[PDB]
Amino acid sequence: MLQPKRTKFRKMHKGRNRGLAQGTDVSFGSFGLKAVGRGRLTARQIEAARRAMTRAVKRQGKIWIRVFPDKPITEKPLAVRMGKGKGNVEYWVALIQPGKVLYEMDGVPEELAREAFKLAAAKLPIKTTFVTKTVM
Amino acid sequence: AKTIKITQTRSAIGRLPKHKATLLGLGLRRIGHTVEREDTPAIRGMINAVSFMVKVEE
């Protein structure tokens, strides 16, 4: 479960999630799993998809995770009223915009990369698509 | 010199204050009201600001 080792501040404004992604090319491997939709990826989701990916290729090749969950999310406990300060940090997310390459793979055939990425996408709350490296 | 005719085509109810002030500067008082104004860049700028609710007869 990824999570910043330390941060300047404990809590963060909700913010919004507009725009298209930066980092839309396969930059490290040969195959990538790219986001088509918009949303949040929790650290548990990122890790559940990593495990499914890694078991499918029998821990061969190499896998990059291009996203990191650096945004803390707070929640108010059950049976607590409104007010009395911001809630407690409960988990961490990465904000995803369309076009974001989420994972990359190398050192395996394309057919196996497609199958491994399919099993991973089934763990994620956002629609995705399989991409390959381009020369330009 | 040259003049143009401007007619108000939509209501002013609920428009932005700047838009109401522009209709005032053109002299337009109601839907269907037509005024005749000199053709200057200042007049053309006022028409441009409220072009969605006026029509020009060149």
Binding site: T24, G99, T134, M136 | -
Partner: protein, 94 residues
């Protein structure tokens, strides 16, 4: 051997470019040398098939625009963020 047919653009900017891509074309620019840059439109389907060949990005191409032939190299390409489409190409005069 790669030949591309193009037209000179008669309208530029955000609105004109989005109307191009909604009509299955896309804009591009030819610059370099001492000639002024030339803004052109390409048919999206034809060029998207050609650029799938790796030699598109290494060879010297020919852009036929208004009858005249121009020798160029592909210099930069803007791709759609997640669809398999092209938004723009820079061509440098060769």
């Amino acid at each position: 051997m790669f030949t591309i047919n193009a037209e000179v653009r008669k309208e530029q900017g955000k609105g004109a470019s989005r109307r191009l891509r909604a009509a299955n074309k896309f804009p591009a620019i030819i610059y370099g040398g001492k000639e002024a840059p030339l803004a052109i439109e390409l048919d999206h389907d034809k060029v998207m098939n050609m650029q799938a060949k790796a030699e598109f990005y290494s060879e010297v191409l020919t852009i036929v625009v208004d009858g005249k032939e121009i020798k160029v190299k592909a210099q930069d390409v803007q791709r759609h963020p997640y669809k398999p489409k092209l938004q723009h190409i820079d061509f440098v005069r060769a």
